[model samples]
Target: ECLGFGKGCNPSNDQCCKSSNLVCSRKHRWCKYEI
Candidate 1:
């Protein structure tokens, strides 16, 4: 799990959220429900 404001990661396939809210983004190996 990661946030765009403060986080780390495998940009290739990691959980990342925008600084606006708790909503997360899905990567190559992830889905919306899974994010």
Candidate 2:
């Protein structure tokens, strides 16, 4: 899995936590357990 901090506050200079490029919709199971 990918792990990093959000942009602008990144101290490691790693290219992670970039804003997602796609729109996401909630699936019932994931919505209840993940998000």
Candidate 3:
């Protein structure tokens, strides 16, 4: 499942993001869409 902005994500599991603009942050351990 794809995670939206601000949603929790696991970098090791290769968590998919809902949007192309979104990126998984290793430090935050979640999907971030920062401008």
The candidate scoring highest on TM-score is 3
Error of 1 at 11 (Å): 0.8
lDDT of 1 by residue, 1-35 (tens): 54554344444554565433433333433222333
- For candidate 2, lDDT tens digit of each residue in 1-35? 22333222222333333353222213311111112
Inter-residue clash pairs, candidate 3: none
Candidate 3 lDDT, tens digit per residue, 1-35? Answer: 68877778886774656565767789988887768
Model 3 gets an lDDT of 0.74
Candidate 3 off by > 4 Å? 18-20
Inter-residue clash pairs, candidate 1: none
Weakest 10 consecutive residues, lDDT, candidate 1?
A: 25-34
Q: Between candidates 1 and 2, which one is better according to TM-score? A: 1
Candidate 2 weakest lDDT stretch, 10 residues = 25-34
Residue 22 in model 3: lDDT: 69
Tell me the deviation in Å of residue 30 in model 2: 22
Q: Name the best candidate (by lDDT).
A: 3
Q: Tell me the whole-model lDDT of each prediction, alpha carbons only.
A: 0.42, 0.26, 0.74
Query: Distance (Å) between predicted and true CA of 18, model 2?
Result: 1.8
C-alpha positional error of residue 31 in candidate 3 after TM-score superposition, expressed in Å = 0.4
